[PDB]
């Protein structure tokens, strides 16, 4: 009831043994009371890393998207080493979503070892199980066995109806995923551990489908973008290998489903000046001239009977002399060109009324005309060439024309393919203009360039008119164990890409959210524009170029920082070489680097003086010792992980306050939230995500099941809580309910439709779906439902919730009226009470631990001690946690070496990895999450608690208590001990 503290552990250790005399009775009682539970105490075990690789093919339908929507790929499994390194080999194949699927080394859902099908953004198929939301459901198949050598896996995806189906060795899999969220793009993915051998098959020249595709499905190889090339890549990464060594990589830019639809602007509806009947006629004449010259060059002749084979021009006149079906066509062509020009914000009209006289045409010899004879002289336009603004105008005109063509094609049912298949109504140019290659852009732009040149030659009046930040900003720092407090230090950073790098020195208290230089904590340099950043970007030196190196320099003896570039010291505006002066030591400084989206760069410390370039030029002879020169182990580093995780509300938050009054009469204990700065300056308002610090768990078996009746109090299984929403808070865009431990969504405009939920439907031998279980990450009442239940009412909105652990049905209520929002869950699942609020008032929400008639308050399910106590209580452990967008995480010392190549046109791309890699994972019972044991270096409280826990183990095992030793053998393993002894970090 009072959280995790080490004083009580010391008390227990004192209870165990004293005066060199062991109380076996007390030791056994303590053992019985805590060891079997395996809860409320940290647990450790050794696991294996998991790595996932995708085929770089993104497909997903939308409103007007060019994606075909029906796709099919195949996977060969050739070599499997089962139970390698005393652990079963992990191997899964499936699909994953572009947004929300961010696998990282370690730190998986529950215990470590996450992969495809362990998160609701991904779906995978095991040997005999179906994985989704970290839930394992065995699947009935004609052959039930794990992934073995020489195995064939076929995965097919349909977007028209949301279906994902699988087949093993020609035998269809009897379970499918349906009703999943179609937001984003889907890509094939395989997750694996050490000792695997897989081969991709996507059809076409690549690989070969050993089994025929299902009807209506298309191979995945034809979905590659025209400028894109097939190449395997990992899902996401923060580091890479290169010639110099470890090269850090920043955020990766990704496309969206909305990008795949063309978005043009209507132009024919716009009225035009009367210049169309004068100057646009002359432009049409010029178009006729140029087109006739193109035919002349091609060898086309003037034969009045139009015949393409015989090269005959129907008009057969030097003047185009085209009829209304032809002349009007070319006239409306030019008219639409002018309409597009005006719609781009440019002008349409005339601005010289005399430059057309200056135009003198280009006379050509008689060889151009033949047959009846057509030699329209090209009207010379060299008098006015195309400015860069004019070129941009042509580019936008071509973009608009391609977009209107593409919207027509998608309206009539055109789907893009890498190959061209007119009978199947599929062209490679169906991608948007900016997605087109340079050749198609040129073919859609050349004639428009000529038309704009006609405009210029005549001299017209045409003249030109939060979470994303976290995802696109990445920060790297050190272990904080090497916080230098004195001396002179040097470290180098090679900026491989010209993009925005920020490198410098920061204090140990750098918040991951705060960008480098925006606060006094970090003195940084950004050479994208070439300025030093501290409380603002002030000019300093010059920006670098791709491949340059920055020699960052610090002397705490003189309290200054110096930046050099390629051996040249950057020199400020005032004339001081030092970027900053009088830099107080404070709590020390650490190297820090921040990378932008689509950026790479190498961070070289002082570990390798030989590899340290330009050190002799600037760093050496000035007393600046290379940082961490004497270290034999690599300097462990920490990366600014962009992953929403719930953390307790800090008491120093300038805008939110938690009051926590309790013990009132006729009112149950409660926790109040208030807006400190509401109705004042700098009163930021944004979506807020809150939950309780502890969960409640359902029964392992779902075997049905005035003055309150005591017998009904004892028999009842339901638990109740309430929420008091004060006046002034928006009754919409608010949610109250229960979230899974792994649930996390930092959406700025969150909605109940934005929750992740997929229905796994289990077909039988007859094809009839059974066990249609809906895995959803959250279950709570919609804000529209709240406002419908019900200016904002002066009486506070009452939001009651009833959880039934025995049966699994979930009930909600608003202001004493049971809201229609209801749910059903699975046995052995735990949920957290969560409230999502859009603050719009000084007083917003107040969570409340209350009871009702014949209803047991939450505290009984929340704590085992009070399981039969009807009095509602709020122990100090129960606290409110807010969703933290960014948190710091430590980079693993070593990474798996996976080799991916293309064996050939038959075997496809082959992926193989055989290097084992293990680590010790520390699991939190209540949070259902795990972290690396080495991460506890910066987490002293958890480290202290775990150390006291080990001391308690020694105390209970002391003085030859062999039974207790055997009992502890389960919790602490021999392999874990040996790995701990051989551990160095």
């Amino acid at each position: 009831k009072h959280g995790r503290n080490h004083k009580v552990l010391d008390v227990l250790c004192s209870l165990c043994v004293c005066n060199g005399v062991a109380v076996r009775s007390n030791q056994d009682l303590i053992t019985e009371n805590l060891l079997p539970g395996r809860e409320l105490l940290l647990q450790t075990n050794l696991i294996n890393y998991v790595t996932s690789i995708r085929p770089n093919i993104f497909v997903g339908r939308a409103e007007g998207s060019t994606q075909y929507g029906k796709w099919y790929f195949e996977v060969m499994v050739d070599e499997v080493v089962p139970f390698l390194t005393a652990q079963a080999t992990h191997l899964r194949v499936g699909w994953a979503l572009t947004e929300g699927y961010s696998p990282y080394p370690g730190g998986g859902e529950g215990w470590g070892g996450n992969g495809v099908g362990d998160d609701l953004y991904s779906y995978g198929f095991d040997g005999l199980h179906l994985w989704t939301g970290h839930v394992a459901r065995p699947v009935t198949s004609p052959g039930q066995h794990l992934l073995a050598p020489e195995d064939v896996v076929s995965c097919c995806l349909d977007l028209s109806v949301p279906s994902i189906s699988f087949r093993i060795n020609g035998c269809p899999v009897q379970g499918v995923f349906e009703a999943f969220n179609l937001d984003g793009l889907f890509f094939p993915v395989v997750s694996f551990s050490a000792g695997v051998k897989v081969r991709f098959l996507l059809g076409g020249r690549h690989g070969e489908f050993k089994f025929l595709p299902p009807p209506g499905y298309a191979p995945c190889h034809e979905a590659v973008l025209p400028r894109e090339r097939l190449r395997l890549e990992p899902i996401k990464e923060y580091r890479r290998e290169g010639p110099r060594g470890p090269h850090l990589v920043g955020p990766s830019r990704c496309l969206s489903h909305t990008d795949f639809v063309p978005c043009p602007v209507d132009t024919v509806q716009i009225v035009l000046p009367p210049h169309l009947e004068r100057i646009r006629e002359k432009l049409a004449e010029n178009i006729h001239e140029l087109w006739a010259l193109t035919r002349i060059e091609q060898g086309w002749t003037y034969g009045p009977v139009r015949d393409d084979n015989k090269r005959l021009h129907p008009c057969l006149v030097n003047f185009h002399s085209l009829p209304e079906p032809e002349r009007n066509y070319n006239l409306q062509m030019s008219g639409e060109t002018l309409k597009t020009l005006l719609a781009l914000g440019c002008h349409v009209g005339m601005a010289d009324e005399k430059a057309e006289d200056n135009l003198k045409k280009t006379k050509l010899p008689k060889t151009y005309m033949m047959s009846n004879g057509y030699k329209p002289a090209p009207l010379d336009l060299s008098h006015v060439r195309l400015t860069p603004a004019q070129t941009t105008l042509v580019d936008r005109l071509a973009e608009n024309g391609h977009n209107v063509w593409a919207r027509d094609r998608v309206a009539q049912g055109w789907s893009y393919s890498a190959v061209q298949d007119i009978p199947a109504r599929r062209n490679p140019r169906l991608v948007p203009y900016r997605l087109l290659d340079e050749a198609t852009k040129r073919s859609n732009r050349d004639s428009l360039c000529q038309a704009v040149r006609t405009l210029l030659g005549y001299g017209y009046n045409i003249e030109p008119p939060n979470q994303s930040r976290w995802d696109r900003v990445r920060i790297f720092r050190a272990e904080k164990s090497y916080t230098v407090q004195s001396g002179r230090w040097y470290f180098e950073f090679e900026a491989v890409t010209t993009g925005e790098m920020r490198v410098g020195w920061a204090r140990p208290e750098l918040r991951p959210d705060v960008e480098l230089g925006a606060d006094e904590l970090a003195y940084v340099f950004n050479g994208h524009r070439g300025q030093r950043w501290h409380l603002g970007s002030e000019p300093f030196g010059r920006p670098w170029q791709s491949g340059d190196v920055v020699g960052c320099m610090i002397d705490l003896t003189e309290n200054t920082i110096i930046f050099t570039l390629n051996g040249e010291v950057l020199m400020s505006d005032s004339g001081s070489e030092t970027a900053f002066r009088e830099i107080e030591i404070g709590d020390g400084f650490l190297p820090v680097c921040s990378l932008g989206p689509g950026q790479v760069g190498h961070l070289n410390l002082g570990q390798d003086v030989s590899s340290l370039r330009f050190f002799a030029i600037c760093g050496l002879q000035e007393g600046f010792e290379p940082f961490a020169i004497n270290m034999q182990r690599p300097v462990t580093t920490w990366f600014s992980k962009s992953l929403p995780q719930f953390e307790p509300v800090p008491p120093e938050h300038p805008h939110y306050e938690v009051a926590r009054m309790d013990g009132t009469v006729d009112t149950p204990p409660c926790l109040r939230l208030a807006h400190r700065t509401w109705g004042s300056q700098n009163s930021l308002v944004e979506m807020l995500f809150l939950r309780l610090s502890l969960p409640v768990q359902f029964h392992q078996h779902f075997r049905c099941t005035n003055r309150d009746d005591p017998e009904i109090i004892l028999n009842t299984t339901t638990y109740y809580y309430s929420v008091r929403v004060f006046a002034g808070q928006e009754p919409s865009c608010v949610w109250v309910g229960w979230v899974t431990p792994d649930y996390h969504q930092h959406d700025m405009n969150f909605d109940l439709s934005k929750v992740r939920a997929v229905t796994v439907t289990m077909g039988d031998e007859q094809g009839n779906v059974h066990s249609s279980l809906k895995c959803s990450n959250c279950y709570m009442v919609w804000g529209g439902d709240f406002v419908s239940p019900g200016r904002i009412s002066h009486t506070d909105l009452v939001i009651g919730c009833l959880v039934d652990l025995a049966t699994g049905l979930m009930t909600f209520t608003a202001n004493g009226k049971e809201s229609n929002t209801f749910f059903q869950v699975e046995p052995n699942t735990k949920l957290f009470p969560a409230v999502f609020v859009l603050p719009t008032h000084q007083n917003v929400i107040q969570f409340e631990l209350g009871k009702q008639k014949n209803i047991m308050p939450l505290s009984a399910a929340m704590f085992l001690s009070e399981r039969k106590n009807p009095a509602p209580q709020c122990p100090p452990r129960l606290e409110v946690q807010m969703l933290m967008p960014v948190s710091w995480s430590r980079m693993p010392n070593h990474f798996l070496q996976v080799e991916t190549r293309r064996a050939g046109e038959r075997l496809g791309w082959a992926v193989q990895c055989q290097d084992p890699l293990t680590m010790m994972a520390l699991h939190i019972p209540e949070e259902n999450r795990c972290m690396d044991i080495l991460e506890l270096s910066e987490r002293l409280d958890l480290q202290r608690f775990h150390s006291h826990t080990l001391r308690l183990y020694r105390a209970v095992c002391a003085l030859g208590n062999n039974r207790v030793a055997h009992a502890l053998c389960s919790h602490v393993d021999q392999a874990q001990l040996l790995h701990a002894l051989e551990d160095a970090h």
Partner: nanobody
Amino acid sequence: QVQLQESGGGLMQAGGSLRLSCTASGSIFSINSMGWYRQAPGKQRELVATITSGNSINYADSVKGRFTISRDNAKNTVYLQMNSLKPEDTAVYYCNADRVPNGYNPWGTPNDEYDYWGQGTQVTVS
């Protein structure tokens, strides 16, 4: 958008008369030209003698026989008369409307791609 259909072209012996009407319902704009296409079973879809508004008829190498064509812009219908039937004339006939007039477009790939096909109808020669 522009939904088009061929009506007619049933099975008849050699020399049988076959009237295939072709009608496209849609926006009246960019409706100046169109043609007919011939695809033998398992073969390429070549071009039947095309016609454009203004009664401009253009022939090709697949016109050996009676390939009569006649268009009416008021009701926007085009009739193809297949009176000469030959063993090699058995094919699926499609009807395709396009903005490109007289088989030429001084614009390039966009307008060229600005075409509208039709469901078509199968014709077999006995």
